[PDB]
Ligand binder design. Sequence first.
Ligand SMILES: OC[C@H]1O[C@@](CO)(O[C@@H]2O[C@H](CO)[C@@H](O)[C@H](O)[C@H]2O)[C@@H](O)[C@@H]1O
Ligand SMILES: OC[C@H]1O[C@@](CO)(O[C@@H]2O[C@H](CO)[C@@H](O)[C@H](O)[C@H]2O)[C@@H](O)[C@@H]1O
Ligand SMILES: OC[C@H]1O[C@@](CO)(O[C@H]2O[C@H](CO)[C@@H](O)[C@H](O)[C@H]2O)[C@@H](O)[C@@H]1O
Lengths: 180, 180, 188, 198
Amino acid sequence: AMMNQDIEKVLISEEQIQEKVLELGAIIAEDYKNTVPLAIGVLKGAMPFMADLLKRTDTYLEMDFMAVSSYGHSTVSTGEVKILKDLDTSVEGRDILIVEDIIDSGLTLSYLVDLFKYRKAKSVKIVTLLDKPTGRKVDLKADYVGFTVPHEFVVGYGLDYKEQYRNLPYVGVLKPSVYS
Amino acid sequence: AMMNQDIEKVLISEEQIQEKVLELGAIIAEDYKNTVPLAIGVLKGAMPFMADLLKRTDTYLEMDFMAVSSYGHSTVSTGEVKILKDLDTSVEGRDILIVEDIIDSGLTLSYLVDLFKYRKAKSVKIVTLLDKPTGRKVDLKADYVGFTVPHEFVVGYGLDYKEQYRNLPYVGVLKPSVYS
Amino acid sequence: ENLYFQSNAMMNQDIEKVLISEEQIQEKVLELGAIIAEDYKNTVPLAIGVLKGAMPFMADLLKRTDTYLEMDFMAVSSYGHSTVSTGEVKILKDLDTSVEGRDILIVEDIIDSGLTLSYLVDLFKYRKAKSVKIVTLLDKPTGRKVDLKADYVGFTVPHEFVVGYGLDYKEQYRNLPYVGVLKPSVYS
Amino acid sequence: MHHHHHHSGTENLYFQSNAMMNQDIEKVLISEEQIQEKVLELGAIIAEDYKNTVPLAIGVLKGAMPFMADLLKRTDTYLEMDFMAVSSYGHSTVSTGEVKILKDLDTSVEGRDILIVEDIIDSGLTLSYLVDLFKYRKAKSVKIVTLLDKPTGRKVDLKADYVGFTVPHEFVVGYGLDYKEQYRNLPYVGVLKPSVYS
Ligand SMILES: OC[C@H]1O[C@@](CO)(O[C@@H]2O[C@H](CO)[C@@H](O)[C@H](O)[C@H]2O)[C@@H](O)[C@@H]1O
Ligand SMILES: OC[C@H]1O[C@@](CO)(O[C@@H]2O[C@H](CO)[C@@H](O)[C@H](O)[C@H]2O)[C@@H](O)[C@@H]1O
Ligand SMILES: OC[C@H]1O[C@@](CO)(O[C@H]2O[C@H](CO)[C@@H](O)[C@H](O)[C@H]2O)[C@@H](O)[C@@H]1O
């Protein structure tokens, strides 16, 4: 029927997300006021948050995107992933802001962060809509965080279950029958 | 020292874009009620509109993205472009909805539509925020359109000038001094 | 984590027999190069190899093709369902130049089901190639899952578990200078 | 006559019907027979050096393909092949080596012995970027084999572990090396006539 028919509970409402994005955007705009950073999202989950975040960030910036895929074993050990789409511009000397939907193990993100430092970024910071710090497999701290969630079992606003639900305007938890 | 100071005039306000996105999403949700389409955005310019449109599209769908680059002359004459990032899933038998920020010549978008048909898509439809039909170099009509514009000399809500301004939450016209 | 034991093992010990020797491959490559050079007298084709298996053959063939031409490469990967039925694959690396108006020569190590290659040929036709032809070192036409005849063929094979000269078994043996059949013990 | 265009950002190429490559070459610098003898030697050295491990031998497209094919077929040891493709980010690639990855390795680098196979090294900037990318990815070791070397042309410190031939002041094409995408398919390394390139 309707997608709400699959949602057990709304954890973060659209109104709550909108207020947070407004707040974070104002903070990021002030922190990068005299340097046009490169704001980068990792496909696909970061897309909705990145779009609304940046639209509330009143400062000059450039957008870009990466796509990556798992190598399997090395990905779940060091976070190394295969670059499917690299950035359209060089990193050297740039201030990089990685926009993410959620950080859990933090392995792939940590790999990307240190890749950008290898590429001589002037700086690298991270903004994430959701953080689950109890999931860390590496010490990786986001610089800007929307909400801290006790678990990563949620859908909406970029987050998927079998590639669906990313288009929900809120963050929720699925009913058990959907996945089991 | 800030962006709005580079804008001569707002052509479509943020409020007009939100109302339009709301309307378009309700139409698209109805049209695709039965089957879960694959909604595709071509990076980078389609991202903000795609995020906000799909958030307002209350139906089951899958999101995906493509990245392409110019080959030079064939791109300008046939629309043929290099695929830098192909879809994550196969096209055969799927209903495809391409989400675009603006259609002008329509050459590349047409190359992509007919590629998806070569790949045996069940159907291919297009939703664009902006359309400039006077600019066409191929017969390509969008199925869903936000606003009809004159000229592609506009920035904001995905549209850039030298990679900047895409993060404005409205569509505007730059002051002549910005681009000389 | 990973420990490797090769001891004094040599690849030839894994080979039951040499099916197509280096000498045989080189004589056929020389003939094919002369025929292609004559056929493409009037054009400069875009010769494309699909990574990884086509590489050794493509290098030797083109070195024996005395005519102007350009080289390019593609990389693709399976979608897991439409790949087995339609040949549709994900493009991981597209060509570095446009196909429009070019005479395309696809260089392959082996054609078996032919599904992916059939997909690529008609993609290049959609992209307005002036012509598309295929040269394959080996052909296993009994494996076909679609109607696809290569324009130039080195050898007909039927065998299972063939390796060498770009053909692999679990990513090994591509660097052999001949085409061999593996001992059954190697793959049990 | 015949013509075509290629990228880039476009060039138009016009050929007379009886134009032949060889006549574009002033002299053969390194003959096919010299190359065969060198690959045989290097292949044997490489097989001995990598007797204890299954290396990942990686070619950077497009130029490295012919040498890589011939060298590896003379390298009688267990190994895996892979390929990368890269693009320039413009003037910044020219000064730092940083390039856009268009095709990454099909397998992970962590813990692997990587052997990069190149056609020529001159400034060394891009290769150096790739070597240290693999070290960032925790390669067990990274070594380089190049057919041709111009070591006084370096803009970064990078010594190739294995080198076929050192090239002097000559504009070379063939055996993977191009001029405007032509000549890669010559079975030798030739000195291109000044008239061809100005
Ligand atoms: O594509 C390589 C892949 O192919 C497999 C399929 O699982 O079988 C063989 O195809 C090889 C093509 O390189 C060829 O070398 C052999 O003749 C087949 O065994 C697999 O073995 C290999 O990894
Ligand atoms: O198209 C001519 C153009 O191609 C380049 C880059 O592919 O060739 C190489 O650089 C060397 C220096 O000229 C050249 O000798 C070899 O063919 C390639 O390494 C570029 O240099 C040349 O102008
Ligand atoms: O060890 C032989 C091996 O070394 C190379 C460079 O990798 O050549 C070097 O050694 C040669 C003599 O052994 C010298 O003639 C040459 O000038 C020097 O660079 C390879 O060419 C050779 O196969």
